[model samples]
Each structure stands twice: as structure tokens, then as C-alpha cells.
Target chain A: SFHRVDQKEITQLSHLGQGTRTNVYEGRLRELRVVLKVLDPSHHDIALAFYETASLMSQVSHTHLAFVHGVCVRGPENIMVTEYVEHGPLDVWLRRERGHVPMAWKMVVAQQLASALSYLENKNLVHGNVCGRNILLARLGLAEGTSPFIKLSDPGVGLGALSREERVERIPWLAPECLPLSTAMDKWGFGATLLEICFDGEAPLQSRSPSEKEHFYQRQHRLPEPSCPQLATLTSQCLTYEPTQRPSFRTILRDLT
Target chain B: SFHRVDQKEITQLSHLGQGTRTNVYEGRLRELRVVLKVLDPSHHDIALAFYETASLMSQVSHTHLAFVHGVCVRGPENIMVTEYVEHGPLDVWLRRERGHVPMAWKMVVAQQLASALSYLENKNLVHGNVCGRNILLARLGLAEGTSPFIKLSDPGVGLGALSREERVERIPWLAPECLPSTAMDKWGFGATLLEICFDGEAPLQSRSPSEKEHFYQRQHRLPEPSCPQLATLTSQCLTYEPTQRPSFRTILRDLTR
Candidate 1:
């Protein structure tokens, strides 16, 4: 009984956006500030999605990930209620504040987001989507105020899940040679995001559009730079298109940092 | 001469959805339906992601995946345009009709999805988000009203785009105990999704989230079912957890019909 929140009490969060299968709202229910993701009336995959989400989030624990407080399948809507952050999305934060960020703050957020990715990696799960737009920055904790502790959001939910013996890989955030991509590509993508956040919005190839960026990545083993040279190196390793060549997130954490 | 679509002409077919880092829009840039993903502005990692998507999609051609048309990046956006289908996401389609999907249709979808996963096996990649939500039902050529075949969409782009080698023994879609809260657990999760889409949402155990429910999954190895074989077989592959599992593609040609 304690595990479930009263649905009636749940106020819909402001409409954050509309997705193909759902609409995201930010509101509070059960005295909690949460981002309520209600499945659209025509969008029918809520039950299956909620189940998979429950399965995945149950396995991961990290301060950088907006936690899933509870899920409701009983009402007219299938609801996935997650921790709500007033701070807003990471892209907004980075764009508005640019690189005025502190080195320490950057380090902490980088490490945390990386830690989250690493955790997922160990589980053989990939954050198919890893970019600054998906990250949320919480003010630095216990520091005078407003420190950038970033929370990575949205582990993509629709691709086929794998068996124990299966391997993890991804596209869109890896080296050009290794398309049909993998997790190592994620590491690189994560590295790139980390670099972007640390340097504000102009991390690398800031001028490129959605389609032009391919040319930038075609340069073999090359990594864009801003700060933390070692980290850049790790990004390079993560960029290895070949799964065989990519390093484990654990390994990257150890050697790079 | 026509290697790709004009950048400006990439019109959205329909909206797919968004993860943390990308906004997936279904579009038609040239003459075909392509899934066009625009990067989150905050996520300044286009080069890495572009390279990966292009490399993987161009290199691999499998029935389960929507073929990559090309990846193009313009100013401020990173775009990934892959083969698109007319049908919507598998989960949405299934739920529209409720759980009473024709057994044959379920079998066809499941088998195709698995075959895609099997292709990933050949490439050594895991489809991390293996739910019906990710699969798409696209028509192949239509002779009058009858379409020849259906297609699965977006195989796996999770677990940091992991590779089989990077993660030795984790599962994605299976039970928690089998996956044991590790990133490697994504594969098991894939198997589970495979089962659900193929077999009717079977009568599972009470709180039996991760128990093996198949006939001859080898890991648990029971005799193939004589009645409604697809359901039993799907359950077996969709075992409650990772480690205990079964099969994949190429053998796909055999399962159809």
C-alpha cells in the first residue's frame, strides 16, 4: 500500500513535450515533485514500456539519473512518475550559462554521468541516447549554491533486449566505421557530451547540423578537445567503432581520471 | 549521383519519439520513409554518433533493421536518416488490438525480431531495448491489398552501444535475478521482449518476473511443444532471466509461415 501513490492526488506536470507514444508532464502527486509521463490515448505501449522501465531502473542506482519513484497501471492512463527537477533540461542550462562553469563542478558532473553510463555498461545495457540535451543539471549539492551536478536522462526503451551472451553496441554516438553501433560508441558519445558540458555549448563541431556532422567523425581515432586531456583520450578509446577496440567504462574511469 | 537526400527536403513522416539525447522523427528525405533523428542541442557529440551510425548501418544489412539511407549533419543538428516503414511501432500496433493478436501475426513478428537479434549476434551486437515498442511493422511491396512481409525497427542502441566482447555475460530483457542488476543484463531483456511480441501475453507466474517459461530453450531445454508451439517456444527464449536462453536469425527464413 505504501509503495503506491494515490492517483487522484497526482497533478499533471506542465506539458514538457509530446512524443509519438506519450506526452510528458511535470506535476506532483503524493506530495512529490515528479515528471509524470502519461501514455497518449492513442499510444498503446504503456504497459509493456512501464514493465521494461521497472525492470531496468530497478537495476540501476545513481544520483545523476532522475529516479523512477513509482509506476501506475491501474487507472485510465499508464503512468511512469519520476523525480522532477525544477532546474530544467541540461541543454537549456548549458546554453544559458555557457562555460562559466567551475572546473570542480565540471569534474563532478562528468564523473557522475560517466558513473551512470558505466553502471549501465556493466549491466550490458547502453544509453542508446547520450547527449547534452538529455542531461539535467542539478545545482551543486552542499556547495554555497548552484553547482552543476548533471543527471543523465532517458535510457531509450524500444530496441531488442539481449541475452547474457549477447553484446551491447549503438549507432549515432560512435566512430563512423562501427555503425550499427555498440556500447563502446556510447562511451565516446558520453565523452563527447562530457566535453561539451564542461566547455559550455561549443564542445566540438558546434557549427555542424544534424546531417553535416558525419564528416567530422570520419576522421579516424580523432577526438575533439576542450579540457581534461586524459578524458579526451578516453573519449578517443570509446570512439573505437570496433567493439573489440573499445575500453570498458570501468577501465576508462580508472585510467582517464 | 543520388547518394543522399537534399538536406532541406528531409520532411518528417511521423514523429517517432525522443529519448534523452535525440528526437526521433519519421520522415521522407528523398523518396523513402526514413527515421530521422535530430540530436539534442545540449548533446554536442554529433561527430561521434554520426560516425557510428554511418559505419554500422552502411556495413550491415539485415532484415530486422531499417536500412540506413545516410547520416547527414547540418548546422546545429545531427541527423540520422534510416529506412522507414509505413506501419507504426509494434507495441502501439499490438495494444491497439489488445492482447488478442492473431497467433500467426505474433509468430511472424517475433520470429523476425529474433532474426534481427540473431543478425546482431553475427555482428556481435545486442539490441538493448528489445520490446515491441522498438519494433516497427512496415510493409514490403504490396500486391493490391496484401503486403508480402513485416519489418522490425531499431534493433539496439543501448548499453552505451555495447559490443558482445565488451560485456561478456549480461542480459538485457530477461528477469532481474538473471541479469542481476548489471549493465550486461540487457540481452536477457531482449529475449523477454521477443517472447511477449511472439507469444500471446502468456499466463506467467505470480511475481515470477524472471522464471524460464519456454519449451526447449536449451538453457532449460524442454521438448518443443506440439500445440501452439510458438507460444511455448517464445516463452522458453523469453526465460525469466539471463544466462538461461535460446536462439536468433538466418534460421529466420525457416520460421516464416
Candidate 2:
């Protein structure tokens, strides 16, 4: 069940980061360790953005989906909270382990994301942001064969509005058409994330310029080859240029399983 | 042995309070519950405070005094983690159980604090900020015929610079002379016993230091207690003359005898 609480009732811990109009901090609600996003005070745009993320997240829940836990709609301080993840961005653990990470576990991560999106797509929900940075790593499933617990975070509700630099940073994950966001957009986004996992945290076309980044997807896209041939073929289908041509998340999830 | 924990090693649970620009959370050090205090980034002096607290608490081990178990010198939170107890504070139980609190258990709580302060006094460390609130109640012994387990928190290692307002709040518990925190421990012990005699309210809650001088000077209708022998000691422990107040060791000896 999701929590709806007041800012004053909760205990806000030391902050994790300080953005221009917001502070992401560690907080506890009852006994749960939570990540609290305190957005700009008295600022409408920021409040609406946070509420948008909160509303979107509250609409869905899946085993592989990490959703919002609480929001403070009545407040001088606009706050959004989620259950804390022990490890951070999917890339963080990847970079630490580098090439030593097992491909089997990597596949597990894909299936997890695939399953999350598969459920969301049926709900006709388009993931606004899906990237390695938003998928968190967890310690609970560190079993040698099972992948560590992984979940796709919703558009990162507690996250501040994207800057020009961040928008461009996300360009690699965007499809060629740059059409309105849809379930199909995440087919390519999820594929790009698979590519990132393949490289142990490297972007699919890290060397590509911003123009070339989206430009490659515009034409018939040939994504960077993967060391795993099976991954290359599966990733290839998701990154296909036309949204209609790209395989659905259910198809990719089936392939992963 | 002190644990030099990486920030990742510890699990920071829900926060207890956010006050004095610091957050005190219930933390898990290894497997034991601990009180973790993380300071604000403004970085006044938790480093020195953390080091001193960890170093001091590590040297001593007793059944009654809770001690520091770990420190995060390597992390930004400037954390001082200590072995802690729960069910909540002494006053919390006193208030909840109210006048129904058994005299036998109050004696048990009394002896536990005596063991704690007596141990600390020998170490020559001030049991600074002693109060009924610092003593915590536990659930392990909710027996029909015995005293419940109780423990005294240390000088609350995280209280750096001791607040300007906090000093005023503690005046009621201080001796008439308002002497060092060492002698104040004896006064607080007596006041705490008086507090246990009632519900959660502090002893002489609203009286000032000058008024307290006469409040105790006149004996103020000696706090009502069971068994007159221990009653004399409770008054002896809280007497106006700093030296006249009985030491926790002597007071504890009389209680058990």
C-alpha cells in the first residue's frame, strides 16, 4: 500500500543531492528507509512536475517496477518519497564490476525491465524516461544464479526537471522518429539499456555526436555490435527504426526468458 | 572494538528526529540496532565530535551503559553510530503506564541508571544531559513479577555544541548551584525518580534555577515514594548542596540493600 503523509510528520535525513530548486534526501517514514524528494517551495511548475510523476507512478505496480511510496500534496514543502534502494543506478554496479559481470545476470536484468514495461504497455502507459540511470540495483537477490534485484523506477518523480545537458544525454535512448512518447518508444529505450548492460555501463554509441546519436536511429539503425550474439540479435529488433517494426516488450520478455 | 564502517556497510533506517541541523536515525550496525546521527553538510564539527564519541564509548562496556559501535569517518554524513535500545524513552513508559508503573520496576530502572552513571563517573566523563528522557524502556522483560530491562544512553555523543535552548530546558534537573554535569547526574537521577513517581512530566518542570534553589531548599514536600529508606536516599541524591547529593554508587547500594 502507498503512503500519503505530511512533511512535518516525516523525518528528513541528510540530503543525497542538492539541485537548484530541490533537495534529494534520505528520510524515514515509520520504519522504512526512504528517498525523499523535496521540490521547490511555492513554485508551481516544480510542484506540478513532482505530482505528475507521483500520479503516474501510483497508477501502476509490478514486481519489477519500483513505484512511488508517498507524496505530500498538502504542504509548503512539496515532497515525494519512495522506498530506498541499497545500490544506486544500474550503471553504478556495472561500472564497479566491469567485464566480470555475468551475462546470465545481465539477461535477468533485461527480463526484469522487459516484464515491467510489458505490464505498463498493456496499461497504455508510456515510460517517460527509461534508462540505465533510473533502473536501480538491489542487494536482496544476490544469489549466484539469480540476478540481483533490479527494478525500473518511474520517470524518477523525485528528480528535478531535466536540463538541456540532461535532455541531450537522454537523446541516445530516444527513437529516430522522435514521435510522441508511447509504449513503442520504450522498446528502443529498453534495447538501449540492454546495450548499456552489454558494455558494462557504456552507452550504445558513446562515440556518436548528439546529431549522430539520434541521426543513426533515423535511418535504418545498426546498433553497436554486442559480444553476445544472442543479445545483438534481440537488441537489434527493439532498436529497429519504425515503432511498428520494433518488437513488443512481451516478445522481448519471452525471448529473455 | 570500533567498527570503521563504509557508508554502504550500514543500513540507515527511519529517522527519529530532525533537529539542530542534524538527523538522528535508527541505524543497523552489523545486526544491532543503533542510533545514527548525521550532520548537515555545513560541516561544523561532527568529525571531532564523532571521533571523540566513538573513542570514548569504545573504551567502556557495561550492562547498563549503551556504547558507540561504529563511525563513518569516510562518509559525508559524519555519522556516529551507537548500540541502542528501544520501546522508547523512560518518560514514554512512565507516561503510558502512568501511576500504574510498579515501584519494583522503578527501582530496577533506578539501579540501571546508577550502574550507568556510576560507571561513567569513574571514567570521569560527564554524563552530560542526563534526564528521564535519555533512559530507554525495553520490551524484553514485560514480566508479571520482575523489573523490565532498562539501559541508559551515553552523553548522546551526537549532541555537539549543546543547543542554546537545550541548556535552559535542563535547568530544572540541575542542582541548586547548577554545577557541573557530573553532579547534575545525581540531581537528575533523583529528579528522574521523582519523574517516575509521577507520569511523563519533568520534576519541577517550570521552575527556574533560583526558584529551584528554594524549591529544594525548603524540601518542597519531599517527593512521595514507597519505603521511606530509599525515599531518604532519593532526596539525598537530589539535595541542594552539590557535595551533599549522594553518589549513584552509594544510592544504588542502599536500594538493593
Candidate 3:
């Protein structure tokens, strides 16, 4: 259903990162520099999920959503090539450049992410994976004080595709009512991501003892307030125990604006 | 079947050239630079031929043949991606650096092309397009002077699909008795070798204006070679009768010896 690309055209340049389902490669596709997500051939189910997600994502286009150029399926292996985001994943970028980044730029990222999520919601799509790691920043120009470009990536691989460890790893981002897979879950994730960004990539539960953290979530204690008042209020609404009570992405976008 | 590559994964850096059936693009597939051969979607028959050729080519692997990594098909468009050869097409390279290239290096290229064609012939396949443009050069470390590394590309696109004009453009490479498609038409191979030795100089039409004159010329004469031993071998391969033309294996062995 998508444009076909020959396997020979793509030359894998560097190992970007590995996930449970895929390994990311910095590659060249035609004349364009792109990121290649090569699905693990060993896992048939994950490969299925990758193709399904690609089929869904390929139909949609948004400035904030990571662009899916096309997909290449060779035998059991599946490769999804995407636009190369220069600044890399947000979590890593946040930690590495926290000292240099201004608060206004962080707000821009938050607002842009909300815009992307809002767009997805309009399409009746859940950005199944929403975390700092899935957020990519594109460095447009090397101007002295320009804000990094924010784009949300890896949309539509729902909660079912992830492993238990994978889901548990992001417990700090999971909503109280929805363990995973709900559109409402993304709001909670956005809130958690904001908190992580505010803390310079530290998870909300990081400082607490393991027992305390477990108890903290078990009791549904409110998340720590962010320095920004708008974010503080936003997190509160998103972290509500009842998923339905969480503010919609549209509302969140409005608050950010 | 091959891997599906997202169009976004590749950035077309520049247009390489256009053929009768495909447009070539200098592109990046992930991080590795590559060449993208996009079959024109307008012609349904050509697209089918392109896919058929891709399926066949993907199964075969040879160091001398330009490697087929994968293919991407979207809608009517089909793209064949191959490794980016640094030195570009052999015809262009020969013209640009004729004085600098050693005669031994030209012989090396001839031997390599014959090696590739012989390998294809062993597989019961005909590299219908065997010419200087289809021959690619990948320059390795050349400390002052070294034999140029040659890789034959665009094999298996049989001549049946080409138009009369297209055939005429490479008329110098076309065997006198027949068009492309015949595996034993190593006469074109001889003509190509001459083109390389003479610095991309094309074979003479011999002042013949019509088809009959060209056929008469092919039946009576052969391209003059710069090297005497090479001349004997090329002349033997360029025999007018299809049954008399030497197999690629013979030509390869002759070049190597």
C-alpha cells in the first residue's frame, strides 16, 4: 500500500539504538539522509505490529508527527525509514543540553508535542508510545539562540506490542487507570515527560526509595509540582486516578498556547 | 520480495541521470549513500519489467555485479536501490581521467566486466545491457596510481523492452546480427572494451547510412583494438555468427591470461 524502496538503495551508516522490536540505523535512502528502523526478524509478531503501525502511520501527515517515508519488507525482515531528526531523542537531548537550554524552548517542545497529539486525536489515532525517548528534536539552523525543533515519533504501536519490562520501565509515565493502550494514557505520559524534562531527564519517582516510589503510585499521590505554574496544573489534571477525568489533548494544547 | 523503505528514510541529494525507463538519484538510505533507480510509473509495462528484473537480480549475489540491497514499491512507482559507486559511470570516468589512467588499469576493468558477465552467463542469464554507462567504478585508496575497481551494474534488463532509438543510442554496443537479450552477444562486450580503451570513444558506424550497411559492416569488420593480444580476443568474441561468438568464460579466461 506504500511506496516500495529497493534494499540496495539504503546503506546503513551507524547503529542508532536498539529496542525490543527493532534496531535503528542511521542510513542513506536515495539522496536523503534518513533513520532506518529495521524490525527484528526473529519476532514475527513484532514485525506484524511494525507493518500494521506503518500502514496506519503512512496515511497520515503532520508537522509534529514523525514522518514515515515508506517501508521495505524483505522476506521476514521489515525496515521502516524515516526523516533523520538531527537533535536525536528528547530524553537524551534533555540530559545532554539541559545546562544550555532555556525554559522557553522547553515550553515550545511541550506545546508542539500537544499540537501533535491533538492532531492524532482528531484522526482517532493514539500515539501509543509517548515518552521523552520517542520525542525527537530537529536542529533546523545553527543560529546562536534558536529553539530546537520538536517532533513526536513512533506513533501507533499500541501497548500490546510492548514487553512487560518495557511497560514497567515507564511506570512513571503510565496513567493510574490505564496500564497502557488508551488515548487517555498519552496525557499522563505527556505530564510525566514534562516532569522528566523539568528535572533534566530524571524520572518523577527516581529520587524516592523503591519502596517509597511503589507506595507513592499505590496511594495515587499527586505528582511533584513543576516550576512552571501552567505545567504544574496540567500534570495534576493528567495524573488524576480516573482516566476519563484527564484533560483532553485539545485542552492541554490550549493551556500550553 | 524485499524490504520496504520509507521514502522519508531517503533524501535525494541530487539527480544522477535518466535512462529510457528509469531516473537515477543520488540518495541516502539511512546514513550510507546510495543510488536510487526509480522506474517510471507512467509506463505500466516498464514497471512490470522493472519488478521482474528486481526479483531476479535480488536472488543473485556477486562482488563484480552492483549489489541489490532492497526494493521499494509504492503505488505505480518502483525504486531499485544499489550501492553508491564513488567514481561514477565508467564512460564518464574514462573521459575525465583518460590521461591519468594506466593501460593496465583499463585491462583490469575489462577483465572485471568479463568476470561479472561470465558469472551471469553461468547462471543462464544474459546481462542484456553491457556498456560503459552500465559499468560503475568504485575508487578505493589510490595512492598515486592503481587499477580502478570496476562493478558492472544494470544487468538483466533485456533489450526486448528498449525502443529502437534506445537501441540505436548504444548501437555501437549492439551486436551486428541482433539486438540485446542474447547471452552470447558478447560482441557488445568487445565493443565496450574498445570504448574504454579509447577513452569512451564510440565504435564507428563505418559511413553506413542504413540498417543493411550496419549489418554488412558487422559481418565484415570488427572494432580496432589498441592492444594487439586484446584485439585478437575481442575480435574472436565479435564474430558475426551467434554460434561462433565465444562464451563469457572464454573471454574472462583470455583477459586474465
Strongest candidate by lDDT: 3
Tens-place lDDT per residue, model 2, A1-257, is 23578766678897776533567788888656788877766557666666777777887878777768778766477777876776777876788667556777788788778888888888987776777877887542332122467877757532245554445457667665553155787887888888888899887667768666655554555777778886888888887877899988777877877
Tell me which of candidates 2 and 3 scores higher on lDDT. Answer: 3
RMSD for each of the candidates: 25.2, 12.5, 21.6
lDDT of 2 by residue, B113-177 (tens): 78888988877776655677777655324455345666676554344455434444465565545
lDDT per residue (tens digit) for residues B6-95 in model 1: 587686644668743568886655444467866655343434544465556567778667666666666776676766665556555555
* lDDT on C-alpha atoms for all candidate structures: 0.55, 0.68, 0.72
Q: Across the candidates, what are chain A's individual TM-scores?
A: 0.73, 0.83, 0.87
TM-score of each: 0.41, 0.47, 0.47
- TM-score of candidate 2 against the unseen true structure: 0.47
The TM-score leader among the candidates is 3
How far residue B201's Cα lies from its native spot in candidate 1, in Å, is: 54
Candidates' DockQ values?
0.01, 0.02, 0.01
Worst 10 residues of 2 chain A by lDDT: A138-147
Residue B177 shift from truth in candidate 1, angstroms: 70
**Candidate 2 CAPRI grade:** incorrect
Give the per-residue lDDT of model 3 (tens digit) for B63-177: 7777766777756767787777766788887776566666777777888888888887888877666888888876522333455677788653456677666666556677765
